Symmetry: C2
Subunit: 138 residues, 2 copies
């Protein structure tokens, strides 16, 4: 069977500002970089940044809801979100429609998120406050 | 500070064919569905499919290299690739890198991959044969 995300590859227009964002600002571990990409890790996540001349910025209102959420503890969530805000990182969504989340953009307009909680916790919360028409499968 | 990938959300244009693709063809576990989305899991990956009228079925030549790779064992790789081929699933790239990889498209054109191998394995191969401009960080 398939089991797990092996890696997430993000196309980037400029490699150095992207590496700086993920390593310096988000605190991910940089393992290697080369003329056309970089490999970082975030816990078990393998992140590849790939220099792509085809990557364009799109303002968030003109891209779809595809997005990438990173786990953070309840104790660190608010202060890290506030640090991103204070550093001028743009926000793309304010309404918390899926629990405790902060929604921010990377330098290339990729839609990112900080989230507190697992899938099991989300399902348990949704049993009490379900999305419209929600059905649960055991 | 960040501990890993919390969830991957893919915007979809039609919920039913996307659920069929990820649950039935790819074998992910469906945990819940609502009028505008679904939650699935694939190993430790929490996948959300989100119905979005902004999502377009996008040919691969019209999107950048951003993509999502799922882990599969070497032993299972060939039969799973054959399953995708039997289902008529389009391929967007041929593999030219270390470790088995199959590059395929979802119903909306999201770029997916099956990959055999870890970040550690990739780094070991790169240390032996570094890419142009490659620098490592310990
Ligand atoms: Zn999210
Ligand atoms: Zn890949």
């Amino acid at each position: 069977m398939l089991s797990g995300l092996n890696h997430l590859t993000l196309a980037v227009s400029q490699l150095a500002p992207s590496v700086a964002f993920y390593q310096q600002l988000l605190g991910m571990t940089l393992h290697a970089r080369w003329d056309s990409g970089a490999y970082l890790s975030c816990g078990d996540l393998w992140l590849c940044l790939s220099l792509d001349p085809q990557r364009r910025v799109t303002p968030p209102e003109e891209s779809d809801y595809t997005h990438y959420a990173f786990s953070i503890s309840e104790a660190d969530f608010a202060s890290f979100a506030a640090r991103l805000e204070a550093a001028g990182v743009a926000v793309w969504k304010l309404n918390r429609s899926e629990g405790a989340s902060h929604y921010f953009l990377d330098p290339d307009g990729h839609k990112l998120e900080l989230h507190v909680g697992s899938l099991a916790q989300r399902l348990a919360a949704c049993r009490e406050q379900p999305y419209k028409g929600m059905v649960f499968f055991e």
